[PDB]
Design a protein around this ligand. Structure first.
Ligand SMILES: [Ca+2]
Ligand SMILES: [Ca+2]
Ligand SMILES: [Ca+2]
Ligand SMILES: [Zn+2]
Ligand SMILES: [Zn+2]
Length: 161
């Protein structure tokens, strides 16, 4: 049961995708981190230089670690469980089309999902859970909220705020 031994994590957006403006990317990330920050003592802090606990980046096919990307479709991204170095990092396959709306793969939706892993959560059984295996969108992107199951999960590791 891997988990962070500290409630204050630091993140760094190594680079950006050509699909969205620099800002749409930062917002998706911040809104994704904030969903977990709200339901736990977890606190994130942005780093523009050096090594961060969660190294966020975009990439296609082979790109450093042990899990290459498969081009368009399928594995949209992935994250590593809590730990040192490569662990905790979140990588997004830039072979997909990251969108703020529902026209492609919603960056926020996936990012939130990935952070769930970087924090130590695996896939859930609940169909309407954020940590659900299969990626799907929603009609009102504004109506999204952490599913009950996700609350219980993230708190069993770090507890309530
Ligand atoms: Ca790391
Ligand atoms: Ca893919
Ligand atoms: Ca792309
Ligand atoms: Zn990767
Ligand atoms: Zn996943």
């Amino acid at each position: 049961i891997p988990k962070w031994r500290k409630t204050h994590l630091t993140y760094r957006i190594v680079n950006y995708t050509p699909d969205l403006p620099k800002d749409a990317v930062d917002s998706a990330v911040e809104k994704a981190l904030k969903v977990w920050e709200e339901v736990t003592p977890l606190t994130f802090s942005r780093l523009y230089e050096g090594e961060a606990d969660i190294m966020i980046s975009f990439a296609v096919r082979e790109h450093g670690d042990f899990y290459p990307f498969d081009g368009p479709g399928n594995v949209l991204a992935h994250a590593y469980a809590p730990g040192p170095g490569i662990n905790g990092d979140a990588h997004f396959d830039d072979d997909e089309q990251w969108t703020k709306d529902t026209t492609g793969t919603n960056l926020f939706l996936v990012a939130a999902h990935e952070i769930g892993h970087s924090l130590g959560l695996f896939h859930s059984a609940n169909t309407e859970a954020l940590m659900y295996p299969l990626y799907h969108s929603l009609t009102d992107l504004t109506r999204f909220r952490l599913s009950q199951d996700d609350i219980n999960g993230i708190q069993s590791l770090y507890g309530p705020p």
